[PDB]
Write a protein that binds this ligand. Structure first.
Ligand SMILES: Cc1cc2c(ncn2C2CN(C(=O)c3ccn(CC4CCN([C@H]5C=CCCCC5)CC4)c3)C2)c(N)n1
Ligand SMILES: [Cl-]
Ligand SMILES: [Zn+2]
Ligand SMILES: [Zn+2]
Ligand SMILES: [Zn+2]
Length: 428
């Protein structure tokens, strides 16, 4: 997080990261070891707790029987963090339920006790310097923070020395906006982590780098050419959506609005909210009304995922698209969102043919709307590839897997484990 790069003051943005040497597409700018990290509960059996390596036959922790490790080195090395939960899981059993944010924050506190001094993950930005945005948080968020502090005390009281409430409020607020989610090759949620030097990068909607993970190591690779003196920009938000949506998301979490070329011009708003070529052109009240509808349905579906059944979820996706299609083309990003969700439901039901059908409809417009080396696009191709291969559509499967590899070679690097894994899926 230092070679050929420096920390600097980005005008209008704040502290950021600047290139001192050229980078080409695919080049590693830096990697950043996790300051703190946690494997999500639902991936326990499938990944090592320490290093996140996926493989069959992982060795169980003999003390709690809940954690899984590659070997005794992984087990020994994870202990300073694992010790925060090992006995507590035995004590609490099925009542053990700290949120992932609480789990990550407990680790931060343990890390601060064992290694109080600057770590390699903090070459340019320290965890203590993270923005909390505490003065901008509403009462609901502050209430949620108090519930996290209560939970932290409740589940970890035998294993941490707690700072005072005011300090923990700041730390939870910092975790809330600075934590990264680590996702696998299909963008499935693996865990949460703190990558301080990665957190230094400012936001653009035409970013020049992409963040990926090799185990718990964050890696930062160029997705456009970067010249000496140029700022290194990552994206904090999902780039599928139009300018207002993007900025609503930025405002919600980080209390700023973007000033990049995409946001200034809004040149891709029309193509993203692609309107049908009707006989009578629609009127702005009807566009505005359908946009509002779409955004509300997306959000209602987000919640519905927790309590509704799979057939009810598909019905929502189908009905939403039927209503939206008065005004929107199928390549419209809001239509794609719902198809993407319907694809998710099919994969969950193990309806492999139905999932393939949705994926086939998503992929080409989805790829046009995202930047060239989007992990969202790579993930979609990978899912198609695997669906095709399972149904013995070999040529289509090879082709989709190779489209995924093409993106991933740039984003993850050519020697990444995922690529070796996917190349073996083709050679098979
Ligand atoms: C006016 C202005 C200011 C700008 C800007 N770009 C950046 N800024 C500054 C940095 N700002 C923050 O408030 C902030 C607070 C914290 N972090 C780091 C986390 C970001 C999210 N990720 C990830 C979070 C979750 C997972 C998804 C990927 C993003 C973590 C580090 C940044 C305003 C710009 N273009 N304009
Ligand atoms: Cl977003
Ligand atoms: Zn254990
Ligand atoms: Zn391991
Ligand atoms: Zn922007």
């Amino acid at each position: 997080g230092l070679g050929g790069l420096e920390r600097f003051c980005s005008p209008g943005k704040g502290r950021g990261l600047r290139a001192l040497q050229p980078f080409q597409v695919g080049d590693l700018l830096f990697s950043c070891p996790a300051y703190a990290y946690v494997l999500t509960v639902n991936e326990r059996g499938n990944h090592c707790e320490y290093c996140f390596t996926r493989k069959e036959g992982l060795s169980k922790c003999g003390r709690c029987k809940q954690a899984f490790y590659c070997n005794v080195e992984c087990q020994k090395e994870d202990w300073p963090m694992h010790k925060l939960e090992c006995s507590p899981m035995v004590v609490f059993g099925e009542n053990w339920n700290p949120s992932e944010t609480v789990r990550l924050t407990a680790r931060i506190l343990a890390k601060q006790k064992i290694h109080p001094e600057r770590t390699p993950s903090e070459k340019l930005l320290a965890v203590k310097e993270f923005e909390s945005h505490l003065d901008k948080l509403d009462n609901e968020k502050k209430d949620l923070i108090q519930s996290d502090i209560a939970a932290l005390h409740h589940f970890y009281s035998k294993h941490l020395e707690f700072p005072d409430n005011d300090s923990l409020v700041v730390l939870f607020a910092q975790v809330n906006c600075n934590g990264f989610t680590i996702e696998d090759e299909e963008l499935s949620h693996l865990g949460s982590a703190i990558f301080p030097d990665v957190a230094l990068m400012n936001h653009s909607c035409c970013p020049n780098v992409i963040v990926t993970y090799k185990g718990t190591l964050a890696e930062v690779r160029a997705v456009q050419e970067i010249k000496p003196g140029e700022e290194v920009f990552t994206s904090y938000i999902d780039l599928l959506y139009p300018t207002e949506d993007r900025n609503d998301r930025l405002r919600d979490s980080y209390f700023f609005t973007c000033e990049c070329q995409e946001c200034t011009t809004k040149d891709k708003d029309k193509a993203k909210v692609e309107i049908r070529k009707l006989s009578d052109p629609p009127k702005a009240e009807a566009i505005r009304d359908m946009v509002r509808y779409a955004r509300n349905v997306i959000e209602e579906f987000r919640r519905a995922k927790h309590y509704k059944s799979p057939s009810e979820l598909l019905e929502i996706c189908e009905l939403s698209q039927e209503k939206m299609s008065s005004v929107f083309e199928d390549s419209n990003v809001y239509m794609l969102h719902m198809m993407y969700q319907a694809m998710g439901v099919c994969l969950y039901m193990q309806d492999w043919e139905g999932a393939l059908q949705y994926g086939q409809k998503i992929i080409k417009p989805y790829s046009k709307h995202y930047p060239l080396y989007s992990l969202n696009v790579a993930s979609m191709w990978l899912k198609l590839g695997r669906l095709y291969m399972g149904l013995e559509h070999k040529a289509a499967g090879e082709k989709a897997l190779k489209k995924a590899i093409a993106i991933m070679e740039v984003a993850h690097g050519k020697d990444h484990p995922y690529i070796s894994e996917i190349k073996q899926e083709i050679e098979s």
